[PDB]
Amino acid sequence: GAYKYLEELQRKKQSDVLRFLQRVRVWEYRQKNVIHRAARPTRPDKARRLGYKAKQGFVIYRVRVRRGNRKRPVPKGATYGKPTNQGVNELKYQRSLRATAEERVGRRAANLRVLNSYWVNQDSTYKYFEVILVDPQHKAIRRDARYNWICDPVHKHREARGLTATGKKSRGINKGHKFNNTKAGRRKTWKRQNTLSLWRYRK
Amino acid sequence: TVKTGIAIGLNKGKKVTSMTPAPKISYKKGAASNRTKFVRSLVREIAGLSPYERRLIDLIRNSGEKRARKVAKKRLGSFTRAKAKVEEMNNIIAASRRH
Amino acid sequence: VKELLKYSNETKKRNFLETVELQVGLKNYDPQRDKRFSGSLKLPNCPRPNMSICIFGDAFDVDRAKSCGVDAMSVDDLKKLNKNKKLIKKLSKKYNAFIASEVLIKQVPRLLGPQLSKAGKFPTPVSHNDDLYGKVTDVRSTIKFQLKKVLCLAVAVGNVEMEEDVLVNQILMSVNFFVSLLKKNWQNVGSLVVKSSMGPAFRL
Amino acid sequence: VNVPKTRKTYCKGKTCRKHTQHKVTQYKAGKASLFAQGKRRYDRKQSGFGGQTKPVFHKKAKTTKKVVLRLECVKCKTRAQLTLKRCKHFELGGEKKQKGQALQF
RNA sequence: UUGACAUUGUGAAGAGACAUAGAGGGUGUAGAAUAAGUGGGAGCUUCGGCGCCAGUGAAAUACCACUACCUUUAUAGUUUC
């Protein structure tokens, strides 16, 4: 078996071979468009444990996201309010850049459905990811019961409702005592304990 | 860990005939199999060393394990990781450059 | 393992060409500081003799100058004082007591130098002379830590078979490691360059 | 003003319970250390936007400070604190004022 | 606006020291004798020769080693300029 070797090689990033490959590929990917098609998964291991089965319908896209904080709008810096809220430069945009990549390729290939995604590369200006989209109307995926749950219409834009891999992190959804503000969802657990419940026979 | 029978003290608890059941098969998740050892050794000898590992095998031969732990904790997260990483670099220097 | 090399054993017996008693020498390696109170300051009992010649200048007193005429090397007194301060050097190590501690200020310029006297470390002024003489003529080791990092001692003779010398290098490993102070490093068995007197060095 | 550098006063020590000698020093504020609770909380609240949060003082008028003397016993070397009134020129030294000698003008 | 880190690589200079050997260097008294210290130790080589002893000094040697001390990089990769 030889995905274990790719797995462990990809775990050794700043070694001399992988930083050579990382430099050639950050050059090559920077010379193409912002969102373009990956003909073949550049990491068959990491694509393969996220649900890629190489047959007709699975598509990889490769996507550049601009990298850094979020300079707020509201022009010439004036927020018009309390000096609590007077920041511009240092505000940090709660969704990860991996989520922005998934959402943008979700809009551009709107017939397809995002499945997960994975990192590939970064310089200072850009992060490059690959998204592992599925074409749900294709007959190879409308059959084959391990992957036909994507065909159901509740998974339209899993990427935009935080339902993907990096979404459920960015929503803070895990079990624990460290996720009490967002465990079943942040606003449902807000609203269920700002709701005054009144009975008929008031206790 | 026989509980003493009273409400407080050294072993706090009720006397209960115990069972010590069959083990779950995890509690053994991290233990590396023969295939994992061969693969990780092979990729370690292909891949070489990352540059902070080169600067740590610098400091172990030159300045010593105290300053190596002081850099490796700074270069990584936790101090318990700076233990095992400097242990790895001790094994790397000792098993190779001696003979 | 200590079995592949010689280290006390039969393997290094024909390497040296001198057919005289050539003793094996073990060197410990542990980085210590420059101080004098740290390190392994102890000389234990060596169970097999080192097979050396040593004569004792027993300058004893009333209660202890009688047990030297049975099992000892030389019988001396405190009256013979004009020899051990000027001329004579025919000795290897002495043996004294606690009953006469005012004669010790006189034999210092000649015998403290080449290790023929006692200062603070070796069990030379031991009072008992009826049982400790079955331990000093069977010649012991020499645990003496130097300035930066070395510990040169002697275990036994290379011509001695590997049957007497099987629990001697093991009992000596438990002395420089367990009387060890906390100014010693990890893997105190770090480097053991063992050479006897003439042949090559056999290390672990 | 002036005080003696020694003072035989009461000494609670569980072994003294009596007037012993005490050496007398003058009190210092102390090094304003981090990692105490209020400085940690203050340094968290000051983080980010908002500006100055906890109120900062401008209005002082008391020209002096009350002076605290640190008494130390000499047997059990425990420490007691003691206080004075407000005073401008404080010294713990000697040179007791004389019996009215020749003033030299 | 100014600094640090990242994007950020490859050659050629000047010093700090490590894989990797070895030539030599290291002169306050005394002591055949330049013993920077230690361990074994009365002998080795066909012989010669030195050595044990003797004497000396804080240190006794012929013979094999460790730490070291100042050079020497000719062999390999890292440092701040």
| DSSP assignment string, chain B | ----SSSSSSS-S--------PPPS-S-SSPPPHHHHHHHHHHHHHH---HHHHHHHHHHHHT-HHHHHHHHHHHSS-HHHHHHHHHHHHHHHHHHS--
Instruction: Please judge whether B47 and A17 are an interchain contact, meaning their C-beta atoms are less than 8 angstroms apart.
Output: yes
Residue matched to tokens 């047959």? A55
Q: Is C194 helix (H, G, I), strand (E, B) or coil?
A: strand
CA-CA distance, B96 to B53, in Å (whole number)? 15
Method by which the model was determined: cryo-EM
**Helix (H) or strand (E) run with residue D73 in it:** strand D66-73
CA-CA distance, C189 to C191, in Å (whole number)? 6
CA-CA distance, D11 to D77, in Å (whole number)? 9
Nearest CA in chain A to B43: A9
Q: Which of A161, A162, A109 is nearest to A132 (CA)?
A: A109
Which nucleotide is closest to A30, CA to C1'?
E7
Chains D and A touch (3+ CB pairs under 8 A): yes
User: Is the C-beta of residue C51 closer than 7 Å to nucleic acid chain E?
Assistant: yes
Those residues whose C-beta lies under 8 Å from the C-beta of residue A130, and which sit 6 or more positions away, are A38, A41, A42, A43, A47, A60, A61, A62, A63, A117, A118, A120
For residues C7 and C199, the answer to whether their CB atoms sit within 8 Å is: no
Residue matched to tokens 């006897």? C196
For residues C74 and C56, the answer to whether their CB atoms sit within 8 Å is: yes
User: Any idea what the Cα angle at residue A127 is, between residues A125 and A129, rounded to 5°?
Assistant: 160
As a residue count, chain B comes to 99
Q: What are phi and psi of A64, to 5 degrees?
A: -95, 125
CA-CA distance, D23 to C3, in Å (whole number)? 71
- For C82, what's the count of Cα atoms within 13 Å in the CB-facing half-sphere? 0
The answer to whether residue D47 neighbours chain A at the CB level (below 8 Å) is no
Q: Residue A8 CB: number of other CB atoms within 10 A? A: 19
For residues C148 and C1, the answer to whether their CB atoms sit within 8 Å is: no
Q: Please tell me which chains touch C, using 3 or more CB pairs under 8 Å as the contact test.
A: none
C116 CA, E60 C1': Å apart: 13
Q: How far is CA B52 from the centre of its chain?
A: 19
CA-CA distance, B61 to B94, in Å (whole number)? 11
Residue matched to tokens 């927020």? A79
| SS3 readout for A59-113 | CEEEEEEECCCCCCCCHHHCCCCCHHHCCCCCCCCCCCHHHHHHHHHHHHCCCCE
Nearest CA in chain A to B36: A4
For residues D63 and D21, the answer to whether their CB atoms sit within 8 Å is: no
Residues 95-134 of A with CB under 8 A from D: none
**Which chain E nucleotides are covered by protein, judged by CB under 7 A?**
6-9, 17-20, 37-45, 53-60, 62-68, 77-78
As a residue count, chain C comes to 204
For residues C22 and C158, the answer to whether their CB atoms sit within 8 Å is: yes
For residues C100 and C60, the answer to whether their CB atoms sit within 8 Å is: yes
As a residue count, chain D comes to 105
Instruction: Please judge whether A83 and D48 are an interchain contact, meaning their C-beta atoms are less than 8 angstroms apart.
Output: no
**Helix (H) or strand (E) run with residue D11 in it:** strand D9-11
For residues C46 and C141, the answer to whether their CB atoms sit within 8 Å is: yes
CA-CA distance, A91 to A73, in Å (whole number)? 11
CA-CA distance, A139 to A148, in Å (whole number)? 10
Q: What are phi and psi of A45, to 5 degrees?
A: -65, -55
CB-based burial, B30-53: b 16+ in 10 Å, e otherwise: eeeeeeeeebeeebeeebebbebb
Nearest CA in chain A to D49: A84
CA-CA distance, A102 to A157, in Å (whole number)? 9
Tell me, what DSSP letter sits at residue A140? Answer: H
Return the axis-axis angle of helices B51-62 and B79-96, rounded to nearest 10°: 70
From residue B16, how far is each of A164, B7, B19, B20, B95 by CA, in Å? 47, 14, 9, 12, 51
For residues C51 and C157, the answer to whether their CB atoms sit within 8 Å is: yes
Give all strands (DSSP E) within chain C, no chain letters.
25-28, 58-59, 75-76, 151-152, 193-195, 202-203
Instruction: Please judge whether A87 and D51 are an interchain contact, meaning their C-beta atoms are less than 8 angstroms apart.
Output: no
CA-CA distance, A95 to D67, in Å (whole number)? 58
The answer to whether residue A77 neighbours chain D at the CB level (below 8 Å) is no
Those residues whose C-beta lies under 8 Å from the C-beta of residue C188, and which sit 6 or more positions away, are C30, C176, C177, C180
Residues 15-44 of B with CB under 8 A from A: 35-36, 39-40, 42-44
As a residue count, chain A comes to 203
Provide the resolution (angstroms): 3.4
Structure-token pair, residue C120: 């603070």
Chains C and D touch (3+ CB pairs under 8 A): no
Q: Which of C79, C80, C58, C54 is nearest to C67 (CA)?
A: C58
CA-CA distance, B43 to A15, in Å (whole number)? 11
CA-CA distance, D27 to D64, in Å (whole number)? 14
Structure-token pair, residue A174: 């895990």
| Sequence letter at residue A14 | Q
Partner residues linked to A194 by β-bridges: none
For residues D91 and D2, the answer to whether their CB atoms sit within 8 Å is: yes
| Chain A contact set for D48 (CB, 8 A) | 87
**Helix (H) or strand (E) run with residue A142 in it:** helix A139-142
Q: Is A151 helix (H, G, I), strand (E, B) or coil?
A: helix
Which nucleotide is closest to C195, CA to C1'?
E65
Instruction: Please judge whether A8 and B49 are an interchain contact, meaning their C-beta atoms are less than 8 angstroms apart.
Output: no
Q: Which of C133, C182, C176, C129 is nearest to C152 (CA)?
A: C176
Question: Which residues 134-153 of C interface with strand E at a CB distance below 7 A?
Answer: 139, 142, 144, 146, 148-150, 152-153
| SS3 readout for A7-57 | HHHHCCCCCHHHHHHHHHHHHHHHCCCCEEEECCCCCHHHHHCCCCCCCCC
Q: Is C171 helix (H, G, I), strand (E, B) or coil?
A: helix
User: Is the C-beta of residue C110 closer than 7 Å to nucleic acid chain E?
Assistant: yes
Burial label for B55, CB within 10 Å (0-12, 13-18, 19+), is: middle
Q: Residue A118 CB: number of other CB atoms within 10 A? A: 22
Burial label for D22, CB within 10 Å (0-12, 13-18, 19+), is: buried
Return left, alpha or beta for C172; rule: phi > 0 is left, psi -120 to 50 is alpha, else beta.
Answer: alpha
Q: Residue A66 CB: number of other CB atoms within 10 A? A: 10
Those residues whose C-beta lies under 8 Å from the C-beta of residue D100, and which sit 6 or more positions away, are none
Chains D and B touch (3+ CB pairs under 8 A): no
For residues D71 and D8, the answer to whether their CB atoms sit within 8 Å is: no
CA-CA distance, A106 to A131, in Å (whole number)? 9
User: Is the C-beta of residue C195 closer than 7 Å to nucleic acid chain E?
Assistant: yes
CB-based burial, C55-75: b 16+ in 10 Å, e otherwise: ebbbbbeeebbebbeeebbee
From residue C182, how far is each of A111, C18, C28, C188, D11 by CA, in Å? 70, 42, 17, 11, 42
For residues B83 and B91, the answer to whether their CB atoms sit within 8 Å is: no
Those residues whose C-beta lies under 8 Å from the C-beta of residue C192, and which sit 6 or more positions away, are C7, C26, C27, C28, C29, C203, C204
